[PDB]
Ligand binder design. Structure first.
Ligand SMILES: Nc1ncnc2[nH]cnc12
Length: 210
């Protein structure tokens, strides 16, 4: 069964802004998603310090980037703490209602969209480049779920039947037709080196068969 939910009004407004504003520096989406993955890896590492069985679901802590030119998707995979169903419904573990309010006030007081991550809602920068986003996630305390939204006011949550993950989060970006530069190896390397050089977990960029 699929459950369909309405976004809180502030999040729907944030997403409409991101989608319709003219803003050329779109590459920041990848820095923000990597930063979210890094934070999730830090959390499971911290919990494992006093309970090593938390890593029974996978001891490797890393971030993978998987482009797929056939599907026009870019997938960011981490082995971090993951999300329970309640985390997914509550704006993917963020304080997005309050963070959106602070961000929009900041945009009036001389901030630009690249500061989105300072307000805790960096995930939504994915919609600079994606028409649809799928999040697959597995937390130690819950089942594997899939979240999906094409914006437009609603999101869905279902139990995921795909390949098991062990623990972590996969963010699947269904890219807009004019944003395929983010599938190119050389463009992804440029972004990671510019914005994410000092992330403290290994980032592997997968290659494609062609
Ligand atoms: N990668 C991620 N891990 C856990 N919670 C998240 N919320 C948004 N992205 C996340």
């Amino acid at each position: 069964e699929v459950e369909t939910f309405a976004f809180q009004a502030e999040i729907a407004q944030l997403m409409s802004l991101i989608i319709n504003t003219f803003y050329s520096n779109k590459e920041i989406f990848l820095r923000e998603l990597i930063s979210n993955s890094s934070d999730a890896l830090d959390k499971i590492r911290y919990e494992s310090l006093t309970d090593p069985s938390k890593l029974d679901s996978g001891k490797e802590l890393h971030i993978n980037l998987i482009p797929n030119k056939q599907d026009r998707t870019l997938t960011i995979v981490d082995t971090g703490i993951g999300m329970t169903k309640a985390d997914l419904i509550n704006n993917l573990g963020t304080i997005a209602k309050s963070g959106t309010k602070a961000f929009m006030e900041a945009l009036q007081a001389g901030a630009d969209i690249s500061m989105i991550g300072q307000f805790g809602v960096g995930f939504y920068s994915a919609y600079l480049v994606a028409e649809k986003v799928t999040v697959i996630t597995k937390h130690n305390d819950d089942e594997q779920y899939a979240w999906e939204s094409s914006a437009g006011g609603s999101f869905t949550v279902r139990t995921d039947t795909g390949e098991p993950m062990g623990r972590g989060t996969k963010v699947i970006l269904h890219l807009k037709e004019d944003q395929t530069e983010y599938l190119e190896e050389r463009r992804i390397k440029e972004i990671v080196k510019k914005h994410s050089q000092f992330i403290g977990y290994p980032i592997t960029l997968f290659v494609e068969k062609e």
